[PDB]
Amino acid sequence: AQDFDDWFSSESTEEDQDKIVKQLHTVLQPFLLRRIKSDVETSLLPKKELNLYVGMSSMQKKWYKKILEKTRLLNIMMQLRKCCNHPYLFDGAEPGPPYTTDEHLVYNAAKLQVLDKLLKKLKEEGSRVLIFSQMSRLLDILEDYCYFRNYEYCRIDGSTAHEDRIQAIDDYNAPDSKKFVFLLTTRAGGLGINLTSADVVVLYDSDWNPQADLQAMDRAHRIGQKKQVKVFRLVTDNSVEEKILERATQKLRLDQLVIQNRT
DNA sequence: TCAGGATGTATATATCTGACACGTGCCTGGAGACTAGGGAGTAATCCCCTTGGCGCTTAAACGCACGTACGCGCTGTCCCCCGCGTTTTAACCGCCAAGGGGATTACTCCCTAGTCTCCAGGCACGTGTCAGATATATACATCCGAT
């Protein structure tokens, strides 16, 4: 790898004039054969994105500052991603006992406040949303929030057997089906699962590996999809999520400069 | 169940002694210079630990059901151990003898350690092998429980 990693001049970024990369274009030419889905009209429909930025909530603003300045408050970087997702995960941020599922849950979640409105705006359009979230515990908050709004939902997350998985996917992929939100996790098993009878997914949380979220949005974008599929990605503002997305971005963009110019 | 005894438990009192107070001499804790080296701060570099997860194999752990054997309660029946009176004898002071042992308090002085300077042999670390010990199967021998 010394002749492969370092010789390539620090990923050919700070010491390249689009020449050494041109060399590697033909270096690994006779080893790979990558053919684009653009050249075939299988999905025959390009995808769409938003990167909507969520003004961070109030009680979250308390916690994020609290985490910084010095309960198992270890691995700080991901802890801040919990605060950026929902403070209710911190065991105590939510109002104490007794426990009720009401609008107070919606207030203390900067993403969910924005997400709630958009979940309404697609209800009238006959869309069915496919939430993909990290930290399966985060699903439980959405699950109960789904229970609060009287929405049709089913869950297929980790620790659910495939026979449970297949009946769950049938409920969503049924003829004249009625499920609106169907929960998963960013991994959600292999590519095999068929979600082409859908039109909108939500990447509630981003990931370090963009390819790990590339195929997840391909779950909807797979073959047979006729209508346009809409993919969301909530991004916390002036927080840890800001740096993760660009970290994914440059790793994502690394693919194009290396692979996406051969064929 | 109630009156009849033996035993601490208080009471007050004369006596012994051993804590408490006081004064001196001596040594050591404090003040004050001087210095040098131990540790605190910095800043590379590599490896491990954390917190979220995800998917898979495969034994253990759990639950359920007979169904014994044993933990427990009762009874009996010794026999052994406790309470009490009676002797008696061994501990416990007091003594005597002489000398040795062990602690101090000086003096003296050899010799054996620490303290340095060089300098090479240990020994630890990073490699590259082989063989001792598994794991399976596989046939063998060898208790255990029911006819």
| Span CA (A190) to C1' (B86), Å | 102
Structure tokens, A118:
């958009």
Nucleotide nearest to A156 (CA to C1'): B54
Calpha distance A148→A170 (Å, rounded): 24
Q: Which two structure tokens, joined as six digits, stand for A123?
A: 């209800």
Q: What is the dihedral of CA A190, A195, A201, A207, to 10 degrees?
A: 10
In Å, what is the separation between the CA of A49 and the C1' of B144?
A: 76
The separation, in Å, between residue A233 CA and nucleotide B77 C1' comes to 92
PDB experimental method:
cryo-EM
- PDB resolution in Å: 3.0
User: Straight-line distance from CA A7 to C1' B84, in Å?
Assistant: 108
Rounded Cα distance between A188 and A215, Å, is 10
Task: Give residues with Cβ within 8 angstroms of A223, minimum separation 6.
Answer: A42, A43, A196
Phi-psi region of A91 (alpha: psi -120 to 50; beta: other; left: phi over 0): left
Which nucleotide lies closest to A133 by the C1' atom and the CA atom? Answer: B53
Q: Classify residue A99 by its DSSP letter.
A: P
Query: Which residue ranges have CB below 7 A from strand B?
Result: A 72, 74-75, 78, 82, 135-138, 157-159, 162, 185, 187-189
Contact A219/A201 with Cβ under 8 angstroms?
yes
Amino acid at A204: Y
Å separating the CA of residue A7 from the C1' of nucleotide B135: 47
Where in chain A does DSSP place strands (E)?
A: 48-49, 53-54, 129-133, 153-155, 181-185, 200-203, 230-233, 235-236
Residue with tokens 């985490």: A67
The CA-CA-CA angle for residues A195, A201, A202, to 5°, reads 145
HSE-CB at A218 with a 13 A cutoff on CA atoms is: 13
**Which nucleotide in the DNA or RNA is closest to residue A136, CA to C1'?**
B53
Find out whether A128 and A152 touch, Cβ atoms under 8 Å.
Answer: no
Strands A230-233 and A200-203: parallel
